[PDB]
Protein backbone atom coordinates (compact mmCIF):
# COMPACT_ATOMS: atom_id res chain seq x y z
CA UNK A 1 0.00 0.00 0.00
CA UNK A 2 1.48 3.36 -0.86
CA UNK A 3 2.27 6.56 1.10
CA UNK A 4 0.18 9.33 -0.44
CA UNK A 5 -2.58 7.10 -1.79
CA UNK A 6 -6.08 8.42 -1.17
CA UNK A 7 -9.61 7.16 -0.82
CA UNK A 8 -12.80 9.21 -0.59
CA UNK A 9 -16.34 8.20 0.18
CA UNK A 10 -19.54 10.18 0.65
CA UNK A 11 -22.38 9.69 3.11
CA UNK A 12 -25.74 11.48 3.30
CA UNK A 13 -26.39 12.08 6.99
CA UNK A 14 -29.61 10.36 8.19
CA UNK A 15 -31.64 11.39 11.30
CA UNK A 16 -30.34 8.31 13.12
CA UNK A 17 -26.66 9.35 13.14
CA UNK A 18 -27.31 12.21 15.49
CA UNK A 19 -25.77 12.56 18.88
CA UNK A 20 -28.63 11.06 20.76
CA UNK A 21 -28.86 7.89 18.65
CA UNK A 22 -25.21 7.19 19.43
CA UNK A 23 -26.05 6.57 23.05
CA UNK A 24 -29.79 6.02 23.44
CA UNK A 25 -28.85 4.94 27.00
CA UNK A 26 -27.94 8.51 27.90
CA UNK A 27 -30.43 10.80 29.48
CA UNK A 28 -27.64 13.36 29.38
CA UNK A 29 -27.79 13.24 25.56
CA UNK A 30 -31.60 13.52 25.13
CA UNK A 31 -31.58 17.22 24.44
CA UNK A 32 -28.41 17.23 22.38
CA UNK A 33 -28.36 19.06 19.12
CA UNK A 34 -29.65 17.13 16.16
CA UNK A 35 -26.34 16.93 14.44
CA UNK A 36 -23.96 14.26 13.21
CA UNK A 37 -22.10 12.82 16.20
CA UNK A 38 -18.29 13.00 16.52
CA UNK A 39 -18.34 9.29 17.25
CA UNK A 40 -20.19 8.59 13.99
CA UNK A 41 -17.88 10.97 12.12
CA UNK A 42 -14.92 9.02 13.50
CA UNK A 43 -16.59 5.76 12.45
CA UNK A 44 -17.11 7.12 8.88
CA UNK A 45 -13.39 7.98 8.81
CA UNK A 46 -12.37 4.54 10.06
CA UNK A 47 -14.71 3.12 7.41
CA UNK A 48 -12.88 5.00 4.66
CA UNK A 49 -9.49 3.70 5.89
CA UNK A 50 -10.81 0.13 6.15
CA UNK A 51 -12.22 0.01 2.58
CA UNK A 52 -8.96 1.47 1.18
CA UNK A 53 -6.83 -1.11 2.97
CA UNK A 54 -9.09 -4.02 2.16
CA UNK A 55 -7.59 -5.05 -1.16
CA UNK A 56 -4.10 -5.17 0.35
CA UNK A 57 -5.05 -7.36 3.33
CA UNK A 58 -4.26 -11.04 2.92
CA UNK A 59 -6.96 -13.58 3.78
CA UNK A 60 -7.86 -13.89 7.43
CA UNK A 61 -6.41 -10.48 8.20
CA UNK A 62 -8.21 -7.39 9.45
CA UNK A 63 -7.62 -4.15 11.37
CA UNK A 64 -8.51 -2.44 14.64
CA UNK A 65 -8.29 1.28 15.41
CA UNK A 66 -5.31 2.36 17.49
CA UNK A 67 -5.59 6.15 17.67
CA UNK A 68 -7.81 8.98 16.52
CA UNK A 69 -6.98 12.65 16.75
CA UNK A 70 -9.45 14.99 15.08
CA UNK A 71 -11.15 18.34 15.22
CA UNK A 72 -14.92 18.63 14.69
CA UNK A 73 -15.28 22.34 14.05
CA UNK A 74 -18.66 22.61 12.28
CA UNK A 75 -21.94 20.81 12.85
CA UNK A 76 -23.90 18.89 10.20
CA UNK A 77 -27.69 18.41 10.34
CA UNK A 78 -29.34 15.37 8.74
CA UNK A 79 -29.56 15.51 4.91
CA UNK A 80 -26.17 17.05 4.12
CA UNK A 81 -23.64 14.89 2.29
CA UNK A 82 -20.49 14.28 4.32
CA UNK A 83 -17.49 13.61 2.09
CA UNK A 84 -14.57 11.89 3.79
CA UNK A 85 -11.02 11.57 2.40
CA UNK A 86 -8.32 9.28 3.85
CA UNK A 87 -4.64 9.68 2.85
CA UNK A 88 -2.00 7.11 3.76
CA UNK A 89 0.35 9.11 5.99
CA UNK A 90 2.89 6.33 6.51
CA UNK A 91 3.47 2.70 7.51
CA UNK A 92 5.55 1.02 10.22
CA UNK A 93 5.34 -2.65 11.21
CA UNK A 94 1.65 -3.55 11.38
CA UNK A 95 0.63 0.10 11.73
CA UNK A 96 -0.79 2.50 9.19
CA UNK A 97 -1.47 6.13 9.94
CA UNK A 98 -3.89 8.20 7.85
CA UNK A 99 -4.63 11.86 7.48
CA UNK A 100 -8.41 12.16 7.45
CA UNK A 101 -10.68 15.07 6.59
CA UNK A 102 -14.43 15.62 6.36
CA UNK A 103 -16.59 18.29 4.79
CA UNK A 104 -20.33 18.59 4.50
CA UNK A 105 -20.70 20.45 1.20
CA UNK A 106 -20.84 23.73 3.13
CA UNK A 107 -18.07 23.71 5.71
CA UNK A 108 -15.06 21.55 6.40
CA UNK A 109 -16.29 19.86 9.56
CA UNK A 110 -13.12 18.26 10.82
CA UNK A 111 -9.78 16.69 10.10
CA UNK A 112 -6.87 14.96 11.74
CA UNK A 113 -5.13 11.63 11.97
CA UNK A 114 -6.11 8.04 12.52
CA UNK A 115 -3.99 5.00 13.24
CA UNK A 116 -4.87 1.35 12.71
CA UNK A 117 -3.07 -1.94 13.32
CA UNK A 118 -3.45 -4.96 11.06
CA UNK A 119 -4.53 -8.13 12.85
CA UNK A 120 -4.98 -11.76 12.27
CA UNK A 121 -8.64 -12.12 12.87
CA UNK A 122 -8.70 -15.63 14.26
CA UNK A 123 -5.78 -15.10 16.58
CA UNK A 124 -7.20 -11.85 17.86
CA UNK A 125 -10.73 -13.15 18.33
CA UNK A 126 -9.39 -16.02 20.41
CA UNK A 127 -7.78 -13.45 22.76
CA UNK A 128 -10.97 -11.39 23.04
CA UNK A 129 -12.88 -14.47 24.21
CA UNK A 130 -10.07 -14.81 26.72
CA UNK A 131 -11.09 -11.46 28.04
CA UNK A 132 -14.82 -12.18 28.02
CA UNK A 133 -16.54 -12.77 31.40
Active site residues: 38, 46, 72
User: Is residue 31 at the binding interface for a copy of itself, with CB under 8 A as the rule?
Assistant: yes
User: Is residue 62 at the binding interface for a copy of itself, with CB under 8 A as the rule?
Assistant: yes
| Residue 131 burial (CB count, 10 A) | 6
> What are the φ and ψ backbone dihedral angles of 63, each rounded to 5 degrees?
-150, 150
Task: Please tell me what DSSP assigns to residue 35.
Answer: S
Applying the rule CB under 8 A, the residues between 1 and 30 that interact with a copy of itself are 22-23, 26, 28-29
Compute the distance between CA of residue 76 and CA of residue 9 in angstroms, rounded to an integer: 16
End-to-end CA, the chain: 38
User: Is residue 39 at the binding interface for a copy of itself, with CB under 8 A as the rule?
Assistant: yes
Compute the distance between CA of residue 57 and CA of residue 76 in angstroms, rounded to an integer: 33
User: Is residue 90 at the binding interface for a copy of itself, with CB under 8 A as the rule?
Assistant: no
Least distance (Å) from a copy of itself to the CB of residue 68? 6
Compute the distance between CA of residue 131 and CA of residue 111 in angstroms, rounded to an integer: 33
Compute the distance between CA of residue 120 and CA of residue 115 in angstroms, rounded to an integer: 17
| Residue 63 burial (CB count, 10 A) | 19
* Per-residue contact string for residues 69-88; x = within reach of a copy of itself by CB under 8 A: xxxxx-xxxxxx--------
Compute the distance between CA of residue 23 and CA of residue 64 in angstroms, rounded to an integer: 21
The response to whether 20 counts as a known ligand-binding position is no
The response to whether 40 counts as a known ligand-binding position is yes
The response to whether 37 counts as a known ligand-binding position is yes
User: Is residue 50 at the binding interface for a copy of itself, with CB under 8 A as the rule?
Assistant: yes
The response to whether 43 counts as a known ligand-binding position is yes
Point out which residues bind a copy of itself (CB under 8 A): 22-23, 26, 28-29, 31-35, 37-40, 42-44, 46-47, 50-51, 54, 62, 64-73, 75-80, 104, 106-107, 112, 119, 121, 124-125, 128-129, 131-133
Positions at the binding site = 36-46, 65, 72-73, 116
Amino acid sequence: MRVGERFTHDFVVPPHKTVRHLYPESPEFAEAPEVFATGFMVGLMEWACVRAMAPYLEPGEGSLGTAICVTHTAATPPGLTVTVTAELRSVEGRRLSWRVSAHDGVDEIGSGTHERAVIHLEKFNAKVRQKTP
